[PDB]
Amino acid sequence: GFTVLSTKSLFLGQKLQVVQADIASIDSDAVVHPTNTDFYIGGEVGSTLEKKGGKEFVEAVLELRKKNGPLEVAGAAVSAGHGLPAKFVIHCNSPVWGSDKCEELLEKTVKNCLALADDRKLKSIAFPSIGSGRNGFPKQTAAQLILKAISSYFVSTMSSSIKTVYFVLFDSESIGIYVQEMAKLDAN
Numbered sequence: 449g450f451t452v453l454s455t456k457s458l459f460l461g462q463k464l465q466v467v468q469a470d471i472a473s474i475d476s477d478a479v480v481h482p483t484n485t486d487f488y489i490g491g492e493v494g495s496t497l498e499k500k501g502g503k504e505f506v507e508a509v510l511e512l513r514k515k516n517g518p519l520e521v522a523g524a525a526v527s528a529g530h531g532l533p534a535k536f537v538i539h540c541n542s543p544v545w546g547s548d549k550c551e552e553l554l555e556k557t558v559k560n561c562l563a564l565a566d567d568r569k570l571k572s573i574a575f576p577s578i579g580s581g582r583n584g585f586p587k588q589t590a591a592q593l594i595l596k597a598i599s600s601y602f603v604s605t606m607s608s609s610i611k612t613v614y615f616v617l618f619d620s621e622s623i624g625i626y627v628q629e630m631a632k633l634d635a636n
């Protein structure tokens with residue numbers, strides 16, 4: 449349904465791909481929803497997911513909020529992808545640019561998301577731009593950290609079931625930034 453703009457195949461077999469589309473429409477096993485400690489769903493990603501999933505999507509998040517309690521910084525939690533093409537929604541609470549250890553916390557956020565996907569043996573995960581924008585990270589800084597974390601995760605987790613990682617972006621600058629950063633991984 450969509451078109452891949454750039455592909456980076458890591459040495460361990462994972463395919464990282466940049467795509468420009470509605471992240472809520474992507475048929476990936478998991479979709480990442482950047483949120484806050486209270487599972488707020490008004491973000492741009494949250495909005496498109498609620499648009500797609502409607503009541504079902506929202507109920508699932510409301511139930512998760514109840515069971516999980518406040519989502520700590522860099523924490524991630526999963527709700528069933530009811531009402532969405534994605535099988536699961538992985539909610540994450542990224543640190544805010546400027547926090548004491550915001551950079552290492554952004555990397556941790558990403559790793560926590562990937563870990564939750566592997567816990568369910570998922571084969572694909574779609575990430576929107578995290579950290580930058582809402583949470584204040586410069587776009588390039590966020591991109592570098594996220595890719596560094598993903599790269600690090602795969603060379604540290606041998607049993608990983610994740611075969612495809614999508615970066616779903618909307619603006620040209622973000623696309624340009626991600627393709628540049630992605631090209632730096634396993635390029636020897």
Ligand SMILES: [Au+]
Nearest residue numbers: 547548550551
């Ligand atoms: Au920082």
